């Protein structure tokens, strides 16, 4: 809401301006890596138990 | 009402005075306009 003043001059303000602002947000995406070794797979699975 | 002191001697001795002031009001007006579209009234049914 644009705030207004009634100015002392009788000259016309001609229009007030009241509008809506729309903004597109943005997007980013994060990253990580977890890597496991060869023999660690079979030990969690049970192939080497 | 002006106060006048007693100034004495050979000086010209004066009388208390009076003043009367009239002031005309200066007058102004304001303008604040808001525009409504014709479709905005149609939404108010």
PDB file of C-alpha atoms in Angstrom:
ATOM      1  CA  UNK A   1       0.000   0.000   0.000  1.00  0.00           C
ATOM      2  CA  UNK A   2       1.707   3.182  -1.157  1.00  0.00           C
ATOM      3  CA  UNK A   3       1.123   5.866   1.498  1.00  0.00           C
ATOM      4  CA  UNK A   4      -0.260   9.181   0.285  1.00  0.00           C
ATOM      5  CA  UNK A   5      -0.273  12.894   1.107  1.00  0.00           C
ATOM      6  CA  UNK A   6      -2.976  15.423   0.280  1.00  0.00           C
ATOM      7  CA  UNK A   7      -0.686  18.203  -0.926  1.00  0.00           C
ATOM      8  CA  UNK A   8      -1.688  21.796  -0.213  1.00  0.00           C
ATOM      9  CA  UNK A   9      -1.709  22.751  -3.878  1.00  0.00           C
ATOM     10  CA  UNK A  10      -4.975  22.251  -5.760  1.00  0.00           C
ATOM     11  CA  UNK A  11      -2.997  20.743  -8.641  1.00  0.00           C
ATOM     12  CA  UNK A  12      -4.195  17.186  -9.344  1.00  0.00           C
ATOM     13  CA  UNK A  13      -2.261  14.122  -8.225  1.00  0.00           C
ATOM     14  CA  UNK A  14      -3.861  12.569 -11.391  1.00  0.00           C
ATOM     15  CA  UNK A  15      -3.728   8.942 -10.002  1.00  0.00           C
ATOM     16  CA  UNK A  16      -2.452   7.025  -6.998  1.00  0.00           C
ATOM     17  CA  UNK A  17      -0.247   3.993  -7.565  1.00  0.00           C
ATOM     18  CA  UNK A  18      -1.225   0.781  -5.771  1.00  0.00           C
ATOM     19  CA  UNK A  19      -0.027  -2.440  -7.376  1.00  0.00           C
ATOM     20  CA  UNK A  20       1.179  -5.965  -6.637  1.00  0.00           C
ATOM     21  CA  UNK A  21       4.815  -7.086  -6.726  1.00  0.00           C
ATOM     22  CA  UNK A  22       5.603 -10.639  -7.858  1.00  0.00           C
ATOM     23  CA  UNK A  23       9.051 -12.186  -7.465  1.00  0.00           C
ATOM     24  CA  UNK A  24      10.376 -15.481  -8.824  1.00  0.00           C
ATOM     25  CA  UNK A  25      12.267 -17.128  -6.011  1.00  0.00           C
ATOM     26  CA  UNK A  26      15.403 -18.955  -7.353  1.00  0.00           C
ATOM     27  CA  UNK A  27      16.576 -22.525  -7.006  1.00  0.00           C
ATOM     28  CA  UNK A  28      19.820 -24.164  -5.934  1.00  0.00           C
ATOM     29  CA  UNK A  29      20.594 -27.753  -5.002  1.00  0.00           C
ATOM     30  CA  UNK A  30      23.205 -29.084  -2.579  1.00  0.00           C
ATOM     31  CA  UNK A  31      25.712 -31.913  -2.915  1.00  0.00           C
ATOM     32  CA  UNK A  32      27.532 -34.553  -0.865  1.00  0.00           C
ATOM     33  CA  UNK A  33      29.312 -37.869  -1.408  1.00  0.00           C
ATOM     34  CA  UNK A  34      29.453 -40.898   0.857  1.00  0.00           C
ATOM     35  CA  UNK A  35      31.668 -43.400  -1.002  1.00  0.00           C
ATOM     36  CA  UNK A  36      32.196 -46.908   0.384  1.00  0.00           C
ATOM     37  CA  UNK A  37      34.933 -49.403  -0.432  1.00  0.00           C
ATOM     38  CA  UNK A  38      34.718 -52.825  -2.091  1.00  0.00           C
ATOM     39  CA  UNK A  39      35.025 -55.163   0.879  1.00  0.00           C
ATOM     40  CA  UNK A  40      32.864 -52.905   3.052  1.00  0.00           C
ATOM     41  CA  UNK A  41      29.891 -53.872   0.866  1.00  0.00           C
ATOM     42  CA  UNK A  42      30.094 -57.624   1.496  1.00  0.00           C
ATOM     43  CA  UNK A  43      30.634 -57.156   5.231  1.00  0.00           C
ATOM     44  CA  UNK A  44      27.442 -55.121   5.538  1.00  0.00           C
ATOM     45  CA  UNK A  45      25.641 -57.595   3.289  1.00  0.00           C
ATOM     46  CA  UNK A  46      27.038 -60.732   4.926  1.00  0.00           C
ATOM     47  CA  UNK A  47      28.910 -62.375   2.049  1.00  0.00           C
ATOM     48  CA  UNK A  48      32.166 -62.550   4.026  1.00  0.00           C
ATOM     49  CA  UNK A  49      30.688 -63.552   7.387  1.00  0.00           C
TER      50      UNK A  49
ATOM     51  CA  UNK B   1      -3.992  47.516  25.657  1.00  0.00           C
ATOM     52  CA  UNK B   2      -0.545  49.087  25.878  1.00  0.00           C
ATOM     53  CA  UNK B   3       0.785  49.855  29.369  1.00  0.00           C
ATOM     54  CA  UNK B   4       2.263  53.336  29.636  1.00  0.00           C
ATOM     55  CA  UNK B   5       4.563  54.295  32.483  1.00  0.00           C
ATOM     56  CA  UNK B   6       4.723  57.635  34.261  1.00  0.00           C
ATOM     57  CA  UNK B   7       7.573  59.446  32.489  1.00  0.00           C
ATOM     58  CA  UNK B   8       7.939  62.852  34.043  1.00  0.00           C
ATOM     59  CA  UNK B   9       9.795  66.136  33.879  1.00  0.00           C
ATOM     60  CA  UNK B  10       9.631  68.390  30.816  1.00  0.00           C
ATOM     61  CA  UNK B  11       8.854  65.372  28.601  1.00  0.00           C
ATOM     62  CA  UNK B  12       5.599  65.367  26.595  1.00  0.00           C
ATOM     63  CA  UNK B  13       3.142  63.523  28.822  1.00  0.00           C
ATOM     64  CA  UNK B  14       1.231  60.930  26.817  1.00  0.00           C
ATOM     65  CA  UNK B  15      -2.050  59.049  27.210  1.00  0.00           C
ATOM     66  CA  UNK B  16      -2.705  55.282  27.202  1.00  0.00           C
ATOM     67  CA  UNK B  17      -3.420  53.833  23.775  1.00  0.00           C
ATOM     68  CA  UNK B  18      -5.528  51.084  22.224  1.00  0.00           C
ATOM     69  CA  UNK B  19      -5.083  48.839  19.203  1.00  0.00           C
ATOM     70  CA  UNK B  20      -7.563  46.673  17.321  1.00  0.00           C
ATOM     71  CA  UNK B  21      -6.545  43.949  14.885  1.00  0.00           C
ATOM     72  CA  UNK B  22      -8.681  42.138  12.321  1.00  0.00           C
ATOM     73  CA  UNK B  23      -7.293  39.088  10.520  1.00  0.00           C
ATOM     74  CA  UNK B  24      -8.921  37.469   7.502  1.00  0.00           C
ATOM     75  CA  UNK B  25      -8.610  33.683   7.419  1.00  0.00           C
ATOM     76  CA  UNK B  26      -6.564  32.331   4.531  1.00  0.00           C
ATOM     77  CA  UNK B  27      -8.402  29.318   3.133  1.00  0.00           C
ATOM     78  CA  UNK B  28      -7.098  26.310   1.218  1.00  0.00           C
ATOM     79  CA  UNK B  29      -8.399  22.955   0.031  1.00  0.00           C
ATOM     80  CA  UNK B  30      -6.968  19.493  -0.570  1.00  0.00           C
ATOM     81  CA  UNK B  31      -7.164  16.874  -3.308  1.00  0.00           C
ATOM     82  CA  UNK B  32      -6.864  13.144  -2.672  1.00  0.00           C
ATOM     83  CA  UNK B  33      -8.043  10.903  -5.500  1.00  0.00           C
ATOM     84  CA  UNK B  34      -8.268   7.124  -5.734  1.00  0.00           C
ATOM     85  CA  UNK B  35      -9.071   5.406  -9.010  1.00  0.00           C
ATOM     86  CA  UNK B  36     -11.406   2.429  -9.267  1.00  0.00           C
ATOM     87  CA  UNK B  37     -11.590   0.369 -12.436  1.00  0.00           C
ATOM     88  CA  UNK B  38     -14.983  -0.470 -13.910  1.00  0.00           C
ATOM     89  CA  UNK B  39     -14.224  -4.166 -13.397  1.00  0.00           C
ATOM     90  CA  UNK B  40     -13.569  -3.574  -9.689  1.00  0.00           C
ATOM     91  CA  UNK B  41     -17.169  -2.435  -9.198  1.00  0.00           C
ATOM     92  CA  UNK B  42     -18.355  -5.519 -11.099  1.00  0.00           C
ATOM     93  CA  UNK B  43     -16.487  -7.667  -8.579  1.00  0.00           C
ATOM     94  CA  UNK B  44     -18.481  -5.929  -5.811  1.00  0.00           C
ATOM     95  CA  UNK B  45     -21.811  -7.525  -6.782  1.00  0.00           C
TER      96      UNK B  45
END
